[PDB]
Amino acid sequence: HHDEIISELRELCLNYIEQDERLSRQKLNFLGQREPRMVLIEGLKLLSRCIEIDSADKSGCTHNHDDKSVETILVESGIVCPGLPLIIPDGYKLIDNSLILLECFVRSTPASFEKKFIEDTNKLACIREDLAVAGVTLVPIVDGRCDYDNSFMPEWANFKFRDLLFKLLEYSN
Amino acid sequence: HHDEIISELRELCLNYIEQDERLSRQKLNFLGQREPRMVLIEGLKLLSRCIEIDSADKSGCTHNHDDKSVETILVESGIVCPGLPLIIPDGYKLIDNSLILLECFVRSTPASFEKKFIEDTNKLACIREDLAVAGVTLVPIVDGRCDYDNSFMPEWANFKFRDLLFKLLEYSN
């Protein structure tokens, strides 16, 4: 049954995902879903959020909890940068006149890993000069990962959570 | 003749490598060599230094000009971190209580690119906790590149410089 899969996903979320406050909102969004395709989508977002927070912590920056744009981040610290592409980083840290910007990703093949690393590098590089004129030095960080492992979940639970999400995806295919 | 190759390398160094002060010492070390194997070694170091400075500038940090260790960097800012692995970053920036550490590399295949990215990531990750106890937050940056291009050299000159270094390597093989 699809209800059994959903119930297993619920118990993994509650018992095996570390109780970090930054995950609370997404865990609740996930637990509030009863429709299989919505459980699947919120489950993918939950596992992605674990990876992003893990990357922000390892990179020494603040996880972009409320999906703020670079434009928004600078405005909130009293920095005016007019005419700037829409970039939503995974992490950020405005320190003195330096703006740490973090992009993280997961790729499973070396060729897709390198392609994505170069794309994320170019994405951040595009705003270096725009920030420089506003007196801000870009510190761009690209964190590429080869798997979906993170500090908030034991490896077996992360694997089981992905196995259950796949069964839910098959049920909706 | 090997003297013709050396003379061509000399003119490329002087006429086609941008006159950035951070390259001056290595350009002079290179120009002072007359033996083929020493011209080759100093030429590889020169092209590597162009890439490292280019990475430090793009990463918003200071190029590690005098190959200082992490231990040394912290001592010079009045930060005592006792018992720390020997790590010489390509770049650094101590800002407030945050230590930006930069590792850069060039790899020509996607598999070697990913292998090296993960190794450089782990190298920096090893000191996160050691720095954390000394009140310093590590901001580790790994800049992987797919080629030897840099802002200090036109693409044709960078290619010719590598072509001439290869002919010098063949002469010494």
Side-chain angles (χ1 to χ4, degrees), chain A residues 57-60 93 95-96 98 100 109-111 113-114 117-118 121 128 137-144 146, chain B residues 57-60 93 95-96 98 100 107 109-111 113-114 117-118 121 128 137-144 146:
Chain A
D57 287 348
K58 307 286 225 291
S59 302
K93 199 165 203 169
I95 183 157
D96 276 304
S98 294
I100 299 165
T109 73
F113 182 98
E114 185 193 275
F117 188 86
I118 282 59
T121 296
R128 188 199 318 124
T137 145
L138 174 72
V139 173
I141 311 179
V142 181
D143 181 33
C146 55
Chain B
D57 287 348
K58 307 286 225 291
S59 302
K93 199 165 203 169
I95 183 157
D96 276 304
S98 294
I100 299 165
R107 279 303 175 281
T109 73
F113 182 98
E114 185 193 275
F117 188 86
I118 282 59
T121 296
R128 188 199 318 124
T137 145
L138 174 72
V139 173
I141 311 179
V142 181
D143 181 33
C146 55

Side-chain angles (χ1 to χ4, degrees), chain A residues 9 13 16-17 23 26-27 30 39-55 63 104-106 145 147-155 157-166:
Chain A
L9 283 159
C13 178
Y16 294 100
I17 303 176
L23 289 170
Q26 189 48 40
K27 283 179 178 174
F30 176 73
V39 173
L40 175 61
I41 291 164
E42 294 309 318
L44 298 168
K45 287 179 174 176
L46 179 59
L47 177 55
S48 301
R49 226 58 72 236
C50 294
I51 295 155
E52 293 164 11
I53 291 157
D54 187 73
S55 182
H63 179 258
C104 71
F105 66 86
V106 178
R145 284 137 178 261
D147 62 47
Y148 298 92
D149 294 317
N150 60 265
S151 65
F152 302 106
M153 280 187 106
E155 186 184 308
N158 185 310
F159 182 87
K160 183 50 174 166
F161 198 90
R162 290 180 286 120
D163 180 74
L164 292 161
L165 290 177
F166 180 74

Side-chain angles (χ1 to χ4, degrees), chain A residues 33-80:
Chain A
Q33 308 305 323
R34 31 212 78 105
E35 187 201 280
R37 185 110 205 289
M38 302 305 286
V39 173
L40 175 61
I41 291 164
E42 294 309 318
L44 298 168
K45 287 179 174 176
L46 179 59
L47 177 55
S48 301
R49 226 58 72 236
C50 294
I51 295 155
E52 293 164 11
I53 291 157
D54 187 73
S55 182
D57 287 348
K58 307 286 225 291
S59 302
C61 61
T62 103
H63 179 258
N64 193 13
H65 190 75
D66 299 308
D67 300 279
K68 299 178 172 178
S69 67
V70 179
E71 278 173 287
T72 301
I73 292 152
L74 305 145
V75 164
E76 294 174 352
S77 286
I79 299 156
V80 168

Side-chain angles (χ1 to χ4, degrees), chain B residues 26 36-46 165:
Chain B
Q26 189 48 40
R37 185 110 205 289
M38 302 305 286
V39 173
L40 175 61
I41 291 164
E42 294 309 318
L44 298 168
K45 287 179 174 176
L46 179 59
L165 290 177

Side-chain angles (χ1 to χ4, degrees), chain B residues 142-160:
Chain B
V142 181
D143 181 33
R145 284 137 178 261
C146 55
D147 62 47
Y148 298 92
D149 294 317
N150 60 265
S151 65
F152 302 106
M153 280 187 106
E155 186 184 308
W156 70 266
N158 185 310
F159 182 87
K160 183 50 174 166

